[PDB]
Design an enzyme around this catalytic site. Structure first.
Site, short mmCIF file in Angstrom:
data_model
loop_
_atom_site.label_atom_id
_atom_site.label_comp_id
_atom_site.label_asym_id
_atom_site.label_seq_id
_atom_site.Cartn_x
_atom_site.Cartn_y
_atom_site.Cartn_z
N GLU A 53 11.20 -12.16 -26.21
CA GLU A 53 11.88 -12.03 -24.92
C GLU A 53 11.84 -10.60 -24.41
O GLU A 53 11.64 -10.39 -23.21
CB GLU A 53 13.31 -12.53 -25.02
CG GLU A 53 13.46 -14.03 -25.18
CD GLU A 53 13.08 -14.85 -23.97
OE1 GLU A 53 12.86 -14.25 -22.89
OE2 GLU A 53 13.00 -16.09 -24.11
N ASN B 176 12.79 -13.16 -11.50
CA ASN B 176 12.20 -14.48 -11.39
C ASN B 176 11.97 -14.86 -9.93
O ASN B 176 12.57 -14.30 -9.02
CB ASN B 176 13.13 -15.50 -12.01
CG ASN B 176 13.32 -15.25 -13.45
OD1 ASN B 176 14.42 -14.93 -13.90
ND2 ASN B 176 12.23 -15.28 -14.19
N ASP C 104 12.97 -17.39 -8.31
CA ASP C 104 14.15 -17.91 -7.63
C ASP C 104 15.11 -16.81 -7.22
O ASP C 104 16.14 -17.12 -6.64
CB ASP C 104 14.83 -19.00 -8.47
CG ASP C 104 15.52 -18.47 -9.71
OD1 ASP C 104 15.41 -17.26 -10.01
OD2 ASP C 104 16.16 -19.28 -10.41
N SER D 235 16.75 -14.77 -9.25
CA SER D 235 17.55 -14.34 -10.38
C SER D 235 16.78 -13.31 -11.21
O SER D 235 15.58 -13.13 -11.06
CB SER D 235 17.92 -15.55 -11.23
OG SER D 235 16.78 -16.08 -11.90
N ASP E 244 16.58 -11.70 -15.38
CA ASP E 244 16.91 -11.81 -16.80
C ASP E 244 17.17 -10.42 -17.36
O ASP E 244 16.44 -9.48 -17.07
CB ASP E 244 15.74 -12.41 -17.54
CG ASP E 244 15.38 -13.78 -17.08
OD1 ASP E 244 16.25 -14.55 -16.71
OD2 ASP E 244 14.18 -14.08 -17.08
N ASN F 136 20.02 -14.85 -18.03
CA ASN F 136 19.73 -15.01 -16.60
C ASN F 136 20.97 -14.96 -15.72
O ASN F 136 22.01 -15.54 -16.02
CB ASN F 136 19.02 -16.36 -16.44
CG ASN F 136 18.54 -16.60 -15.03
OD1 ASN F 136 19.22 -17.25 -14.23
ND2 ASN F 136 17.40 -16.06 -14.70
#
Ligand code: NA
Length: 129
Positions: A35, A46, A48, A50, A52, A59
């Site tokens: 990750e 991301n 959308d 959002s 992380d 998220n």
């Protein structure tokens, strides 16, 4: 902070992740490796809108507040910036909530694609634990 592999394993163990919801320590170390490359300061945006955050790439649509993800929840009740700290407490506590939801560690894309079904104990081999 960029953790060493065994350093992170020891910190995660001290914070109660070994066998948490049945996931052995190597699963958590493997997830962190893929990750974030063990870097607490990692961020990724991301499609959308959002983002992380942190060593486990938690998220902002669901888990933390970053002030720029409309219509999101803050189910861990924390600013997302807390997930970037050298102290992994907030990330661990939030991860415990995430993994307790219906899908377990499948919530982490990198775990499902790079760790699940592999020899995850290799990630803690050699460490003083
Ligand atoms: Na949010």
């Amino acid at each position: 902070k960029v953790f060493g592999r065994c350093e992170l394993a020891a910190a995660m163990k001290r914070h109660g992740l070994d066998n948490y919801r049945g996931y052995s320590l190597g699963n958590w170390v493997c997830a962190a490796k893929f990750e974030s490359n063990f870097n607490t300061q990692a961020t990724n945006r991301n499609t959308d809108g959002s983002t992380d955050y942190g060593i486990l790439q938690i998220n902002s649509r669901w888990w933390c507040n970053d002030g720029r993800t409309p219509g999101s929840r803050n189910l861990c009740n924390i600013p997302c910036s807390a997930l970037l700290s050298s102290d992994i407490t907030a990330s661990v506590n939030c991860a415990k909530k995430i993994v307790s939801d219906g899908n377990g560690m499948n919530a982490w894309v990198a775990w499902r694609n790079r760790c699940k079904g592999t020899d995850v104990q290799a990630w803690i081999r050699g460490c003083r634990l």
